[PDB]
Amino acid sequence: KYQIRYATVNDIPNLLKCATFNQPVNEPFFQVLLKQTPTAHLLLEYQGELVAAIFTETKNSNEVLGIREFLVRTSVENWQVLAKDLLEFVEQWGVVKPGIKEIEGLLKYHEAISNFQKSKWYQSSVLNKKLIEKITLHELATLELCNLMAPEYELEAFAARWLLRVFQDMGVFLREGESYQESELVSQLNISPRYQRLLGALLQILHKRGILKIEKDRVFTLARCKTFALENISSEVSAFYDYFSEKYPAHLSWLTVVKRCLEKYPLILRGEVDVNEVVFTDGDMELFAGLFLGHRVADYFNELLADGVCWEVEQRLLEEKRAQPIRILEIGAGTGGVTGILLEKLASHAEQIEFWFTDISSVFTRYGESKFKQFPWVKYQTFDIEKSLDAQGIKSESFDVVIANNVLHNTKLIHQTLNNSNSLLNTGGLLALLEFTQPIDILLYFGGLLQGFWLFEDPEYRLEVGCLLSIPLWQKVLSDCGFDEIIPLGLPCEMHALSKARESVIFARKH
Amino acid sequence: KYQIRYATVNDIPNLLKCATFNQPVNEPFFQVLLKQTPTAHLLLEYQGELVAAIFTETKNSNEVLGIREFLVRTSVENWQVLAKDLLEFVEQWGVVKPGIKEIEGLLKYHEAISNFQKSKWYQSSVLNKKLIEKITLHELATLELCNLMAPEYELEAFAARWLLRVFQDMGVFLREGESYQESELVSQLNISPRYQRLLGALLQILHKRGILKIEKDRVFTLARCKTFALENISSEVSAFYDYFSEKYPAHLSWLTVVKRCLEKYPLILRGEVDVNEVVFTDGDMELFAGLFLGHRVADYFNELLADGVCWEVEQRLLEEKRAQPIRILEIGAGTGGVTGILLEKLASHAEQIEFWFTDISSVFTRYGESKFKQFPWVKYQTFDIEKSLDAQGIKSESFDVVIANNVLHNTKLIHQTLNNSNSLLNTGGLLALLEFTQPIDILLYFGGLLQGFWLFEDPEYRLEVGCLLSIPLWQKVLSDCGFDEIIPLGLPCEMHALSKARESVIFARKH
Numbered sequence A, B: 001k002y003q004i005r006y007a008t009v010n011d012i013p014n015l016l017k018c019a020t021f022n023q024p025v026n027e028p029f030f031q032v033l034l035k036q037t038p039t040a041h042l043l044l045e046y047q048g049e050l051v052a053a054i055f056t057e058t059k060n061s062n063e064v065l066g067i068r069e070f071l072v073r074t075s076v077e078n079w080q081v082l083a084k085d086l087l088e089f090v091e092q093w094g095v096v097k098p099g100i101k102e103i104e105g106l107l108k109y110h111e112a113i114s115n116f117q118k119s120k121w122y123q124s125s126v127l128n129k130k131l132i133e134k135i136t137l138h139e140l141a142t143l144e145l146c147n148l149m150a151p152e153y154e155l156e157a158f159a160a161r162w163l164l165r166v167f168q169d170m171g172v173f174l175r176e177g178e179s180y181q182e183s184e185l186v187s188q189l190n191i192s193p194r195y196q197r198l199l200g201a202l203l204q205i206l207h208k209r210g211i212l213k214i215e216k217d218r219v220f221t222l223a224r225c226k227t228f229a230l231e232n233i234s235s236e237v238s239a240f241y242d243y244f245s246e247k248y249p250a251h252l253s254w255l256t257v258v259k260r261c262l263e264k265y266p267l268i269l270r271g272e273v274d275v276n277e278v279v280f281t282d283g284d285m286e287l288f289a290g291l292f293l294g295h296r297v298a299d300y301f302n303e304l305l306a307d308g309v310c311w312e313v314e315q316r317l318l319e320e321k322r323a324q325p326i327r328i329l330e331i332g333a334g335t336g337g338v339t340g341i342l343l344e345k346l347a348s349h350a351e352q353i354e355f356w357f358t359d360i361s362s363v364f365t366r367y368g369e370s371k372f373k374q375f376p377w378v379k380y381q382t383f384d385i386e387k388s389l390d391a392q393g394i395k396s397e398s399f400d401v402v403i404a405n406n407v408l409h410n411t412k413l414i415h416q417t418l419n420n421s422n423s424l425l426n427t428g429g430l431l432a433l434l435e436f437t438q439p440i441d442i443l444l445y446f447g448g449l450l451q452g453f454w455l456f457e458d459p460e461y462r463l464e465v466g467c468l469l470s471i472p473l474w475q476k477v478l479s480d481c482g483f484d485e486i487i488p489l490g491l492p493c494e495m496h497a498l499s500k501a502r503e504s505v506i507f508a509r510k511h
């Protein structure tokens, strides 16, 4: 029923579609291995379809045989028994090859296929390969987190000292050894209903900085809370503002928003003042837009998101059926900050592409058309990712690229949101996300003030006590919702440590 | 057989000797609670000995009763059943007190005593309280790790790029996707026997930086190893030296030692050149001594070690039997860097104290007397902590303070070393340690070159693949070896996160 034969260079297109165990695929590298050792690499075919393939190498002065790569085609039905059959063939065929003594390390491959864990295995695509190269060679590849995230770190350290003083101004945490239950602080602080969960997240900020001990049933103030808070808000905030504005000017927006929030936090938390009157002063959306451009980490993720979608569009422009334009949709495009850098990128291909600038709020789609009315190929629509496509007049499975920049977490059930995102794309379409992926303090002070931050009803798939997902949780939920080829991206210095990354661009593909 | 009664201020001396569940004891605070509510605090006595005590508070507009502290005397035999009896008394006595509705949260105290975990519970002493205050108010309390450890971080980042190039110069890791087993690199790199385990630790450095994937059976080079290494050692090291020397001049010694090592690392690792000829150039011990003074983190830990021992000496000078002098011993005093700041501190009390400057090597005791011959009260002796006291002419249980600054890990079995340390002290004597407590890269490059780093035979009580112990492992082994009142100290900003601290002063007491 199936055939084992030598790989050839003619098999390279199909080998590039495989999941790989040791490293991402690489067209020019498969070429060189097949040119240098044309009878060292076996594949297994079943009805013309490629199922599994094994590349070997000879090592240790030519006496032991090693596996250099194990490729599998996971969408073939019984592939695990077939890949086991190819493994056992290679062992037999390898020990009797001229000169070999031993086959090195087959048990790891046997275990990998029988207990299959899709996230261990690399997958590849032109897109994956081009983004890794870009990250590897980026100007920021030489710097480390302490340099790159310094502004965020120092803002968050100061803001936490302010936040403890805000609690002390509302009557709690002046002394070490106070004992509360969380429900009792909600009452004693008179937190309005909408912000009771935000209070949990704010307590959690102080917990991670050693100010409070939060346990199953009780919040307990520790010794460090006697000395940690700011002592004079007005003069110390003024002094920090001067220091921070001059030293990290590109982060001025973050400092301004956090300043405007904390200054009025007791009244905001008690429900006595609205946040749109305090921080969204007089429809000053420009302040809020600058949170996400202008500084080198934010521009790095924007460049990563935008180049990825640009590359994917050119990949699909290389296809001869033509006909329908390539349709891109951006969910929650907002003030169109990252959108603007992408439209400039795609603008060369304006006649084959169709770009939908969308947001749940009519306010932001009209903001968008005010900024992009010169682009004939950008269309505007209100769209809510949590609401039915039909009711919103959108054909399912009609988009090639869906873009969502830090919006998808502001929903009730992340599995329903990604299903709906899946419904947007046709098979092979590309999901492109930019997400904060740690429960970062900086985001709570203002982002936690908005209602979308607290819709979530599936905490089992979120971090700590907020609405964010980590890289692993995103990988889990994206696979659960019918995406594969998931590519999580962080700063270059943490590509090996993304489970702790604050921010991440994630691409994924509908299968 | 036992009596439950109200605490009084006359019980405060004995209450200070208890383990506490919520926070460290505090003499002036017990005073104020007993003055304000003289009938709110119960204790349990058994044959005049204090066993357990409970301080309560009324909360929530005077309707619920809470436990403010639970004190226990763990050296009393059946104390856990006695403390349960006092808990159950307090519940009965509390619900019928005038005005109270409910007793808040007794189940946590019940669980704490029946499943006793000594390291949860605070313990106290004059020493503990004074060091917490010092840390809390220290000039460094306002800074965070990224500021304080910047020099170490940047040195370690550069040194790792150099180390990968050192491997590439010895023939491995030029390409992504190479597969080795650890035994096979030992052979292929021709590592001399003494440094085979150091090779493991060096591979581990690159593992944590994403250069290599180290698994049960194999070392696998990743993509990042194509671009990470220095490209021209001579010019890039020169450029870094200039940058680093001018920016962190107080760390010049660390950069010099790492430079001298890595420059000759292949020959050092192959056994072709000795490390004392390369880094200990011509008996230049001053270079090596400056590793541990001169910069603000190192001086902070020295100040913490020295003030702690100074305080403990003055505590014991407040005792009227007098007679024998207070005898201090420093294990592995080395070049006496921290010793010099301590002798200046103790020099006021020179006539009641007797200080033993000791080291395993006669070279370092003579170095010591060259530096401290002006102090009549300092005695010199070669001493090996791993060797028998009797054979070395030292009375057991004769010392009041034993000091060991980053030496105790350089031994074969940490439990035998702490037992021997225990044998030095009389009951109530003080162990004072300064230890690196993460498997830090910086220390491997040169410290890993010395044989004492590799004596250890109990990896189950060490970190990763070196000889260090973390804070929790130190707490475990110190308790296993007969010490209590264990006080782990780190930088002020991490007193709540010491399981990740790079360096720690630890005091402990012989019971």
Ligand SMILES: Nc1ncnc2c1ncn2[C@@H]1O[C@H](CSCC[C@H](N)C(=O)O)[C@@H](O)[C@H]1O
Pocket (backbone or CB within 6 Å): A292, A331, A332, A333, A334, A335, A336, A337, A338, A358, A359, A360, A361, A364, A383, A384, A385, A386, A405, A406, A407, A410, A411, A452
């Ligand atoms: N359920 C939902 N469906 C579609 N858009 C949503 C949404 N919930 C919130 N949004 C929109 O997403 C944004 C929240 S985060 C804004 C990020 C945006 N990319 C920007 O650059 O501004 C808001 O503008 C909001 O209008």
Ligand SMILES: Nc1ncnc2c1ncn2[C@@H]1O[C@H](CSCC[C@H](N)C(=O)O)[C@@H](O)[C@H]1O
Pocket (backbone or CB within 6 Å): B292, B331, B332, B333, B334, B335, B336, B337, B338, B358, B359, B360, B361, B364, B383, B384, B385, B386, B405, B406, B407, B410, B411, B452
């Ligand atoms: N088993 C042992 N017993 C006593 N001293 C030891 C020892 N092993 C090593 N030493 C000594 O401890 C030192 C190793 S670390 C040196 C730290 C020392 N406090 C200083 O400031 O220099 C060396 O000087 C060595 O001579």
